[PDB]
Design a protein around this nucleic acid. Structure first.
Lengths: 240, 5, 153, 215
RNA sequence: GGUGCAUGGUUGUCGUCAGCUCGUGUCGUGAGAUGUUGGGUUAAGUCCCGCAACGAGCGCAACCCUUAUCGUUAGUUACA
RNA sequence: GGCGAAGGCGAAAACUUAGGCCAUUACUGACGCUUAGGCUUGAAAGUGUGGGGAGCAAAUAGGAUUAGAUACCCUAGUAGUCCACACCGUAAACGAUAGAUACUAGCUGUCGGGGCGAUCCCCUCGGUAGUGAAGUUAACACAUUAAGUAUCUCGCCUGG
RNA sequence: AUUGGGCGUAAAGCAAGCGCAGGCGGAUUGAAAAGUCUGGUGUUAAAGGCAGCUGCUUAACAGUUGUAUGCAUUGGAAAC
């Protein structure tokens, strides 16, 4: 159910007394377990707030971007996020340059589309070496461009596992005043983000839960069947 | 930043 | 929408033998209604530098409201030890200032205001001082609203 | 250095402007002295009709001329005044012992040759006009003509004793080491009121793909 | 005749070496940094990986010519 | 690393003795800070007086070195370096940062004291570092041992 | 350089400390009002300054109306 105690089961644990003071603002007093921890009440109230806000944002046919770059877990997670619902996503380290300047990347994306049409047309015009070089530049285009390959309107809201991990994306979002959500920690930056979700990301057990919650936030707006926040039971997740 | 609509 | 020119300076880059004359340009773009911006560009030729600088200035316009066509209160604008003081005066006598300063203030669409520069005389720190001075103030009605005390003024 | 790629780009990649052959190589001096004089006649006299090239073909004591221009009126004129005068000049430079005939031809898209480009730039600069505006209009004209990448260079003075302030512009692709470019080159010597000015024009006119022999 | 810092054209030079730059953006008060950087492979700033970077032009590579394997075409004045 | 106002302070033992810190229901009760003037101390070098002077080495002598060397190299070497008495009071005398005080992110340290009590580990009151926010600055960077915020006083500079 | 400067690296923090005088002065209460600010009176010539008028045919010029600031004294506020 919505923000019910069953969902919040493991969201604690972080760097050892590496805490940015500007987030005692939204973090409980110092924990006694030799690691930085998180509480869940401010958590689920802020989760309801962001839930409804981004939901009614997406009701207005908004432009939404996704990103995830950590080693393997969040990558496959955001791959799932992209695969159920068609939406802008980023799977690798985004090199930047959409909000600060998208007209330049417009040529890159247009050439991507033209060349995809080319393989849709070409049968045997290129030899084995030419074909492999062509497929390799297709892969070069895909691994950095294939998640944002279906838009000319810049997204106005995006998720992130850590603003510090993606300071490039944070700064690019700061070019405009678009809203943004973040899986926040005690070492992050509060003033350079718009929506804060202070939760554990060192342990993937919390990361998967929070990403599924934001996934349901962006899912019910598209009328696609939801996963959690409405399922009374819970499904066990573990990295493997 | 109140909602878009 | 007049976009008065302000100053030109000649710079060059030095390589292993020979110097490349990539002179820089600075322009200030103002609508004379309240929006104002600045742009510094680098190019090998004057026209392209003008285009780049005007693009940068028009992209970086900043809004300032009009308080009876003048700076409503006396305030100092300081940036990097460069400071210019702006003091009000009666209406309808023309503003006495620097040529660049007069260009900035007419791009702000204001009237006679007492000004005086102090200290350093490099154009760029004065433009920083002017922008800081014209943005740092808040409207008297606005400061009244955000203040706990409520007043008609 | 920077060996010119024009002369390297003739023979097996372009077409000779002067095709001729004769008997044992003793009068080659005579036929050459003749045919480049006819060639330079146009390049010296007529710089207003925008003549692209003049093809001289001689074979076994014969001669036939193809002239390709942009304004046939200047080479024809009212009452056929020009054709008779040029015929008299060619007769004066050819002798009274061989045949003489030619055809007047107008070719569409004449701007494909950098020679007339250089001629127009020389006319503009020698018209008491600032170089910047003239050459900007020139590059606008060559880009609107549908041609590929362009490059220009001006030398000499600007009526001032310095060569450290000349300008060249680089636009588009300029592969000269690539032996498929079909890049045209031209140069002109404009005598300004303070010295000699050399203007050089490189133009790219499309790459001939899937070809192994000249045509 | 003089006048090669008036010059043009042309040419040697570093140097057959890979660096030289631009449009966009990012940081800085700006010169500037950026890509061009770092790790591999090289002849390469050739390419790949990542990298507040993104592309692009110049050159590098290659499409040029000759030699070397074989077949066809034409067979003499080669030959026979 | 610690100590002290600094230079500086390191075999041990003895004498005298200072400053310093933690808690101080301790005690009178602003007795507080600064300091023109005034006083004292102040590395080494050096002056004079009296000793001795292992070793070193200003000057200097000899041999190399060189374009020559009274330099860089080697061998000797007066004075001095050591001790006591006075004098001499300059040093990149450095945290190139005057003192005294109040507040202002954070983290990793190090050590002294208290309590917990096998230590470690814990916090507490301090000294002593690094990292690093905000702030300041021309930047270097400083950054809880401020160059952030401020207060009082002393000294100093008006381009070379 | 009280208005309106600085002294880590651009020029300047005494080599260091004790320290009469002087400068700044803890909280709370009472007094007085020396300072302060204020009410009142008198003083500080005119001219010139400032503004208005008049008269020079008119600016310039002269007169004309008021006008500062400082001081002495009377009476109060204790915020300091």
């Amino acid at each position: 159910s919505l923000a019910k105690l069953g969902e919040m089961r493991t969201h604690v644990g972080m760097v050892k007394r590496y805490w940015n003071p500007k987030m005692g603002f939204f973090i409980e007093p110092e924990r006694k377990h030799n690691n930085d921890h998180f509480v869940l009440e401010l958590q689920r109230q802020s989760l309801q707030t962001a839930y409804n806000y981004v939901k009614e944002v997406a009701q207005n046919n908004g432009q939404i971007l996704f990103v995830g770059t950590k080693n393997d877990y969040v990558k496959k997670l955001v791959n799932n996020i992209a695969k159920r619902v068609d939406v802008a996503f980023i799977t690798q380290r985004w090199l930047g340059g959409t909000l600060t300047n998208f007209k330049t990347l417009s040529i890159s994306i247009n050439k991507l589309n033209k060349l995809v049409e080319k393989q849709a047309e070409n049968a045997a015009d290129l030899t084995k070496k030419e074909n492999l070089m062509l497929s390799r530049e297709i892969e070069r285009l895909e691994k950095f461009f294939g998640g944002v390959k279906s838009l000319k309107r810049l997204p106005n809201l995006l998720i992130v596992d850590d603003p510090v991990y993606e300071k490039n994306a944070v700064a690019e979002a700061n070019i405009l005043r678009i809203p943004v959500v973040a899986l926040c920690n005690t070492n992050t930056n509060p003033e350079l983000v718009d929506f804060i979700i202070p939760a554990n990301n060192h342990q993937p057990q919390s990361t998967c839960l929070l990403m599924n919650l934001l996934a349901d936030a962006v899912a019910e707006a598209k009328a696609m069947p939801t996963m959690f926040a409405y399922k009374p039971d819970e499904e066990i997740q573990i990295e493997i | 930043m109140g909602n878009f609509d | 929408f007049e976009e008065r020119i302000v100053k030109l300076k000649r710079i060059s880059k030095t390589t292993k033998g020979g110097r490349n004359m990539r002179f820089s340009v600075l322009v200030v773009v103002g609508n004379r209604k309240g929006k104002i911006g600045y742009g510094i560009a680098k190019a090998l030729e004057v026209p392209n530098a003008i285009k780049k600088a005007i693009k940068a200035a028009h992209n970086s316009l900043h809004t300032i409201e009009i308080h009876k066509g003048s700076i409503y209160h006396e305030v100092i604008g300081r940036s990097g030890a460069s400071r210019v003081l702006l003091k009000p005066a009666p209406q309808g006598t023309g503003i006495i200032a620097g040529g660049a300063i007069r260009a900035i203030i007419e791009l702000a669409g204001y009237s006679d205001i007492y000004t005086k520069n102090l200290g350093r005389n490099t154009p760029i720190n004065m433009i920083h001082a002017t922008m800081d001075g014209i943005l740092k103030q808040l409207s008297p009605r606005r400061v009244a609203i955000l203040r706990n005390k409520n007043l008609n003024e | 250095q920077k060996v010119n790629s024009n002369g390297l780009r003739f023979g097996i990649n372009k077409n000779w402007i002067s095709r001729w052959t004769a008997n044992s190589h003793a009068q080659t001096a005579k036929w050459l002295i003749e045919d480049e004089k006819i060639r330079n006649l146009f390049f010296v006299n007529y710089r207003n009709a925008q003549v692209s090239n003049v093809e001289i073909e001689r074979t076994q004591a014969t001669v036939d001329v193809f002239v390709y221009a942009a304004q046939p009126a200047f080479l024809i004129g009212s009452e056929n005044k020009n054709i008779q005068k040029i015929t008299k000049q060619i007769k004066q430079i050819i002798g009274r012992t061989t045949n003489l005939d030619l055809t007047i031809n107008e070719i569409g898209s004449p701007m494909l040759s950098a020679r007339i480009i250089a001629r127009d730039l020389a006319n503009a600069i020698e018209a008491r006009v600032p170089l910047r505006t003239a050459m900007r209009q020139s590059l606008i004209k060559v880009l609107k003509a549908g041609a590929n990448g362009i490059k220009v260079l001006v030398s000499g003075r600007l009526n001032g004793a310095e060569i450290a302030r000349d300008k060249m512009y680089i636009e588009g692709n300029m592969p000269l080491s690539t032996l498929r470019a079909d890049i045209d080159y031209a140069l002109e010597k404009a005598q300004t009121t303070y010295g000699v000015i050399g203007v050089k024009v490189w133009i790219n006119r499309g790459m001939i793909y899937t070809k192994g022999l000249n045509r």
